[PDB]
Amino acid sequence: VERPASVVKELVENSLDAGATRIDIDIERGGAKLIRIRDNGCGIKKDELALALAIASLDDLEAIISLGFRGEALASISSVSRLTLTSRTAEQQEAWQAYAVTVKPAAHPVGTTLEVLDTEKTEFNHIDEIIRRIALARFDVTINLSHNGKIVRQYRAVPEGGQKERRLGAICGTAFLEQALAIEWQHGDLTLRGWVADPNHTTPALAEIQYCYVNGRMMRDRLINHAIRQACEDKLGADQQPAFVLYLEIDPHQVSRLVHDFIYQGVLSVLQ
Amino acid sequence: VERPASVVKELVENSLDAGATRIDIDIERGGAKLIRIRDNGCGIKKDELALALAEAIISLGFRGEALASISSVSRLTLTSRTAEQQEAWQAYMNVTVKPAAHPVGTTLEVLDLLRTEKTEFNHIDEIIRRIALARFDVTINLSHNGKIVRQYRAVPEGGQKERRLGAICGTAFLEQALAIEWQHGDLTLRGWVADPNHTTPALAEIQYCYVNGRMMRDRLINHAIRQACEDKLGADQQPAFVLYLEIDPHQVHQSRLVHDFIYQGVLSVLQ
């Protein structure tokens, strides 16, 4: 939890794993001043809220801190800024809020919110990137990133088999969206979905977009990249960075040659 | 004339008079279901919040009076925080004022308990459009069911008036827009008028005229603008425009000249 962006990632991640479907994250002054994350995911029972900010004390708590993987992370954060946790769970309950050590009731929908008041705008650009990644990683969750009351981006969630182009356009701009060649490949466990910009029309600006996710986790393999490259260099002798946003899926296999051919094949096909 | 749109207008108005600079208004199901207005203008001290839903403190709430009329028609959920570290609060036949999370501003949830479905939203859209043009200095974001509909960004000192105008009236008009700046003493006529020659009946839908901030609708003002265009070319037909008239306090030669001032202003821009 070094940079603010990193913190955004954390809190935002927590929210997602918490079952979030809408994450409205607002930032003020590179996040240094304010950093608020409000999710509609699971909540935190009043009790957990307390220690969530704060080992002899867990003796009594009787392993309730086990219901807080993020809680552990919160402690690391709160000990670096004015943390103001405030959530309310789903089951028969009222909303609560913690400060600092002071857990009192409050108003809040079945969700969670967090205020944070700890190379100025650079920081925001880092957060923007981060959220971009996540956004593409989870097309099923609305995300709204704002700065100093100024709405910056609104990545609406996409329902079942819906308009993927819209959100893709909002995350990567129409520039890419226009050159986007949608691809759907599948060979048993191997699945390759996503887009690849028409090489012939790929500007170095577009080549900035190179996102590849392997089973949800954004990876970065030189092998996967070479495959996509070679595919384009083969369509046309044009050897240069390609623009893409692909999603690879395979059966648990931490890294295989075939995989390369599967991708090379998938992509190459879409081009022709 | 009490429709949801009307309520939007009220709450939105309140926000503006409260010195707002950004008003993100969201609506759900013609507003019947949800109607949320969040402004970044002066807030409301915890105490005022209470009676605002129900001593000489209610004088600090012209809108507060309005709120009472509303809350007594739906599940009102006021929640604001004044320009101070003092955290946010919220009120709910008695008020339940407790703490809450919210930035220096105000928010209001409204759930009613008839008319049409989508028609209602279109009424709100119109309304916000009016206001938008009336206050080029304040960002407004109207959404529906989580779906962002329009974003009218505010314009800085001597900024780009065309941008926002384009977003409120579309490029169709923006393209035919003939900017006009007239002044004869107290009389001032600013705004735009679409090239008649290229005014489609679709464009003629845009006929907004404000007299000193207040959107008026005088047949006299309209006749003036019309005649001006019918004179440029024999083309007699509804004109497209968005004008702003300014004059010294004079509720309506006292008004004849005004006609000529406008006729003159417009006619000139055409030639």
Provide CB contacts within 8 A for A266, sequence distance 6+: A183, A185, A192
Are both A125 and A215 inside the same structural domain?
no
Contact B147 A154 (CB under 8 A): no
Judge whether B53 and B67 are in contact, CB under 8 Å: yes
The Cα–Cα gap between A133 and A147 comes to 18
Cross-chain CB nearest to B100 (options A22, A106, A149): A106
CA-atom Rg of chain B in angstroms: 21
Neighbouring residues of B91: CB distance < 8 A, sequence distance ≥ 6: B49, B50, B52, B53, B77, B78, B79, B97
Q: Are A149 and B103 an interchain contact pair (Cβ–Cβ within 8 Å)?
A: yes
Chain B residues 50-89 with CB within 8 Å of chain A: 79
How far is the C-alpha of A124 from the C-alpha of A5, rounded, in Å? 7
Residue among B204, B208, B177 nearest B193 (CA): B177
Residues A195 and A158 in one domain: no
Longest CA–CA span in chain B (Å) reads 66
Paired residues of B106 in beta bridges: B39, B80
Q: Which residues contact B258 (CB under 8 A, 6 or more apart)?
A: B187, B220, B221, B224, B245, B247
Chain breaks in chain A (C to N over 2.5 A) after: 54, 100, 118, 255
Q: B-chain residues within 8 Å CB-CB of A84?
A: 101
Q: What number of other Cβ atoms are within 10 A of residue A63's Cβ?
A: 8
Asked if residue A203 and residue A147 are part of one domain, the reply reads: no
Nearest C-alpha neighbor of B147 from the set A64, A142, A113, A91: A142
Residues of B in contact with A151 (CB under 8 A): 24, 141, 151
Residue reference for tokens 């845009």:
B206
Q: Is residue B135 helix, strand or coil? A: coil
Cβ pair A48, A132 in contact under 8 A: no
Residue whose C-alpha is closest to residue B121's, from B30, B34, B32: B30
Q: If contacts are CB pairs under 8 Å, which of residues 179-238 in chain B contact chain A?
A: none
Q: Which of A38, A113, A149 sits opposite B22 (nearest CB)?
A: A149
Q: B210 forms bridges with which residues in the sheet?
A: B215, B244
Would you say residue B271 lies in a domain?
no
Residue B112's SS3 state is: strand
Beta bridge partners of B224: none
Cα–Cα distance for residue pair A100/A212, rounded to 1 Å: 40
The domain spanning residue B86 has which CATH number? 3.30.565.10
In chain A, how long is the greatest CA-to-CA distance?
69
Cα–Cα nearest to A141, from A70, A215, A73, A41? A41
Same domain, B125 and B198: no
Whether residue A113 and residue B101 make contact (CB cut-off 8 A), yes or no, is yes
- Whether B106 has its CB under 8 Å from any CB of chain A: the answer is no
Structure-block tokens of residue B37: 């207005």
Task: Give the Cα separation of A263 and A213 in Å (integer).
Answer: 13
A153 touches chain B (CB under 8 A): no
Question: Measured between beta carbons, which residues in chain A are less than 8 angstroms from residue B80?
Answer: none
Specify whether A150 is located in the same domain as A202.
no
3-state helix, strand, coil in chain B (%, to 5): 40, 25, 35
Task: Tell me the resolution in Å.
Answer: 2.9
Contact B17, B10 (CB under 8 A): no
Q: Does B156 touch chain A (CB under 8 A)?
A: no
Nearest 5 degrees, angle CA B106-CA B108-CA B113? Answer: 170
Cβ–Cβ contact B39 with A under 8 A: no
Q: Which residues contact B170 (CB under 8 A, 6 or more apart)?
A: none
Spell out a b/e string for A162-176, using b for 16 or more CB atoms within 10 Å of the CB, else e.
eeeeebbbbbbeebb
Distance, in Å, from the CA atom of B62 to the CA atom of B42, rounded to the nearest integer, reads 13
CB burial of B118-157 (b: ≥16 within 10 Å; e: otherwise) equals eebbebbbebbbebbbbbbebbbbbbbeeeebeebbbbee
Q: Do both B153 and B249 map to the same domain?
A: no
The position carrying tokens 């240094």 is A32
Q: Are residues B218 and B100 in the same domain?
A: no
Which DSSP string do the residues of chain A spell out, in sequence order?
--SHHHHHHHHHHHHHHTT-SEEEEEEETTTTSEEEEEESS----HHHHHHHH--TTHHHHTS-GGG-HHHHHHHHHHTTS--EEEE--SSS--EEE------EEEB--SSEEEE-----SHHHHHHHHHHHHHHHH-TTSEEEEEETTEEEEEE----TT--HHHHHHHHHHHHHHHHEEEEEEEETTEEEEEEEE-GGG--TTGGG-EEEEETTEEE--HHHHHHHHHHHHHHSS--S---EEEEEE-SS----HHHHHHHHHHHHHHH-
Strands A22-28 and A142-147: parallel
Q: CATH number, domain at A227?
A: 3.30.230.10
| End residue of a domain, out of A145, A172, A199 | A172
Q: Report CA-CA distances (Å) from A71 to A43, A44, A80, B27.
A: 12, 10, 15, 35
What is the C-alpha to C-alpha distance for residues B47 and A241, in angstroms, rounded to an integer? 62
d(CA A113, CA A106): 12
Calculate how close chain B gets to A146, using CA atoms only, in Å.
Answer: 12
Contact present, A85 and A94 (Cβ < 8 Å) = no
**End-to-end CA distance of chain A, in Å?**
45
CA dist A84 and B101 (Å) reads: 9
Q: Cβ contact (<8 Å) for B103 and A151?
A: no
- The owner of tokens 């907004």 is B208
Q: Which residues in chain B are closer than 8 Å to A38, comparing Cβ atoms? A: 101
Residue numbers in A near B90 (CB within 8 A): 107
Question: Hey, is the C-beta of B141 within 8 angstroms of any chain A C-beta?
Answer: yes
Q: Give the residue carrying structure tokens 């890419």.
A: A176
For residues A170 and A179, give the distance between their C-alpha atoms in angstroms, rounded to a whole number: 14
Alpha-carbon distances, residue A239 vs A201, A210, A226, A271 (angstroms): 13, 16, 11, 15
Would B69 be classed as within a structural domain?
Answer: yes
Give the domain-ending residue among B134, B169, B204.
B169
Shortest distance, CA B58 to any CA of chain A (angstroms)? 24
Residue A119 CA: distances (Å) to CA of A8, A47, A122, A126, B224: 16, 38, 5, 10, 57
H-helix segments, B141-255 = 161-176, 219-232
* The pair of three-digit structure tokens given for residue A73, joined into one six-digit string: 């992370």
- Taking CB atoms and an 8 Å cutoff, what residues of chain A touch B79? 107
The encoded tokens of residue A114 equal 């967090």
Burial letters for A81-103: b for 16+ Cβ neighbours within 10 Å, e otherwise? bebbbbbbbeeeeebbbbbeeeb
Min Cα separation B110/chain A (Å)? 15
State the burial class of residue B31 (Cβ atoms within 10 Å of its Cβ: 0-12, 13-18, 19+).
buried
B82 inside domain: yes
Name the experimental technique.
X-ray
CA angle A25, A28, A31 (to 5 degrees): 75
Is there a single domain that holds both residue B25 and residue B158? yes
* CA–CA separation, B189 and B269 (whole Å): 12
**β-bridge pairing A22-28 and A34-39:** antiparallel
Judge whether A272 lies within some domain.
no
Report the distance separating Cα A160 and Cα A158, nearest Å. Answer: 7
Count how many residues are written for chain A. Answer: 272
Please judge whether B103 and A26 are an interchain contact, meaning their C-beta atoms are less than 8 angstroms apart.
Answer: yes
The order of strands in the sheet holding B105-109 is B77-81, B105-109, B34-39, B22-28, B139-144, B147-152
Report angle CA B156, B161, B163 to the nearest 5 degrees: 105
Query: Among A8, A40, A221, A23, which residue's Cα sits nearest to residue A129?
Result: A8
B47 shares its domain with B66: yes
Strand duo B214-216 + B207-211: pairing: antiparallel
B101/B194 same-domain check: no
* Residues ≥6 apart with Cβ < 8 Å to B180: B189, B190, B191, B192, B193, B243, B265, B266, B268, B269
User: Which residues touch B209 (CB under 8 Å, ≥6 apart)?
Assistant: B215, B216, B217, B218, B221, B222, B241, B242, B243, B244, B245
**CA distances (Å), origin A268, targets A182, A185, A210:** 12, 11, 17
The tally of domains found in chain B comes to 2
B49 is written with which tokens? 């919040």
Q: Report whether A246 contacts A180 (CB < 8 A).
A: no
Of the candidates B169, B187, B219, which is a domain's last residue?
B169
C-alpha distances in Å from residue B188, one per residue of B101, B182, B212, B269: 45, 6, 9, 15
CB count in 10 Å sphere of residue B201: 9
CA B92 – CA B211 distance, rounded (Å): 39
Give the single-character DSSP code of B240.
-
User: Do residues A179 and A196 share a domain?
Assistant: yes
Facing residue for A106 by CB, picked from B24, B98, B146: B98
Residue ranges making up the domain that contains B225: 170-266
The rounded distance, in Å, linking the Cα atoms of A144 and A125 is: 15
Residue A176 identity (one-letter amino acid): F
| Contacts (Cβ under 8 Å, ≥6 apart) of A66 | none
Token pair in block for residue B73: 């028609």
Interface mutation target, options A37, A86, A141, A155, chain B, most CBs of B under 10 Å:
A86
Mark whether A98 and A178 lie in a shared domain: no
- A24 near B CB under 8 A: no
Taking each helix axis from N to C end, the angle separating A4-17 and A69-78, rounded to the nearest 10 degrees, works out to 160
In the numeric block, the tokens 């000192």 are attached to B157
